[PDB]
Amino acid sequence: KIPRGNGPYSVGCTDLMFDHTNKGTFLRLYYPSQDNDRLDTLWIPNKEYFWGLSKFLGTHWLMGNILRLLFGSMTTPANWNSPLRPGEKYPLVVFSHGLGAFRTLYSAIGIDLASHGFIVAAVEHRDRSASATYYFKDQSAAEIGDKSWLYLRTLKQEEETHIRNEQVRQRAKECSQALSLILDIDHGKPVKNALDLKFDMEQLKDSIDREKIAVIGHSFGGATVIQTLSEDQRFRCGIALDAWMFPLGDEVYSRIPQPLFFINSEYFQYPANIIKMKKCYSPDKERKMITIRGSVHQNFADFTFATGKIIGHMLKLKGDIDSNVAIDLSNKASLAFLQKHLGLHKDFDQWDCLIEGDDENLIPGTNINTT
Ligand SMILES: O=C1NC2(CCCCC2)C(=O)N1CCOc1ccc(F)cc1
Numbered sequence: 001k002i003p004r005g006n007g008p009y010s011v012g013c014t015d016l017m018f019d020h021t022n023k024g025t026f027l028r029l030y031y032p033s034q035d036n037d038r039l040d041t042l043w044i045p046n047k048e049y050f051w052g053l054s055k056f057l058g059t060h061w062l063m064g065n066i067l068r069l070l071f072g073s074m075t076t077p078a079n080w081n082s083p084l085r086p087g088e089k090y091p092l093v094v095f096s097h098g099l100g101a102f103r104t105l106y107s108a109i110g111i112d113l114a115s116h117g118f119i120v121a122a123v124e125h126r127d128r129s130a131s132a133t134y135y136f137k138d139q140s141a142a143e144i145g146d147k148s149w150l151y152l153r154t155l156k157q158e159e160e161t162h163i164r165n166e167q168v169r170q171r172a173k174e175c176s177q178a179l180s181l182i183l184d185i186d187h188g189k190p191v192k193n194a195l196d197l198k199f200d201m202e203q204l205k206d207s208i209d210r211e212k213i214a215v216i217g218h219s220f221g222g223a224t225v226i227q228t229l230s231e232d233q234r235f236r237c238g239i240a241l242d243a244w245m246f247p248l249g250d251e252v253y254s255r256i257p258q259p260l261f262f263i264n265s266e267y268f269q270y271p272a273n274i275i276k277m278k279k280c281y282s283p284d285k286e287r288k289m290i291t292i293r294g295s296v297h298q299n300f301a302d303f304t305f306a307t308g309k310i311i312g313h314m315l316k317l318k319g320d321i322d323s324n325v326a327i328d329l330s331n332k333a334s335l336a337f338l339q340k341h342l343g344l345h346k347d348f349d350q351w352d353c354l355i356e357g358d359d360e361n362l363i364p365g366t367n368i369n370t371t
Contacts, residue, residue, distance in 0.1 A: 005115020052132030096217030294320030
């Protein structure tokens, strides 16, 4: 079980694709919901994503049918197509997934944020960093549901620097485009969702607190956060969950005026990556860093909840620390940071001590020694 949000609101979920092309925005929306009596949300909703994960693992595509057999019925505790809870303007998080992931696999984070009163737009990147994604070649294909699938690109070592950088720039552009789409929907522009789902997008009119926008992401998504902030000042702060810094150009490090929070796992990080994080620091800039004790890179994604303790620990999906404990720390510390730097009038300042890593399962800053 992926855990329910800890906040006071029920949580809804839906998909939005606009436009229908491979240059369009594709996202999964998690939002405060009126009702709590809808079907839960199917976690990995098409077989092709499992074929995708199989290539990301470097196994035969038959492993995909086995992954699907194991995980293809699993849901996540968000009310599918529930109407939006009205009568309140919600701040917005745009969320970026890791390499080999896709939009649906950080529901534990997305659901928790929504339950505290955020709308979360988990984008699906079309840069070939996703295990899989899809779109429609033209209008005809969109009307009849004829999907075109795009799979993870495997790189030669000679391509790594250049292509990873092309990808993080495209990721940043997709985050800005998703923000613009949501903002245009907030300002009432009618938008025909390329997916025929029974979530009326007109509900989102005048529901976004338009100043209060943040970007959050895991791994490749943590680089995406940083690139996005340097390019798009509409985002007022960023939170990088166990960021993979390699994709970033040397030019970006001095170019992030917004507050930035690094939440790292204990076992993922290494000097080269910490050094790059520390190139983001300047005395004028607001920077914070914490490390979750006993955590691994996968503690931020939903597969940390999808298997039992023994097999999870074997596959590096779980760490020494409990998965619910770990994600509660990351989510609560994120909430306090967002409250601080978006100027929210909620109670998330109860978790301020977590930003300084003041907790027995936290390390202030980093465990990684440099030079
Ligand atoms: O984005 C990056 N990059 C690296 C790989 C390359 C070296 C650096 C680390 C990594 O593991 N991730 C996070 C991937 O996260 C997930 C989560 C769920 C999932 F189904 C698939 C993937």
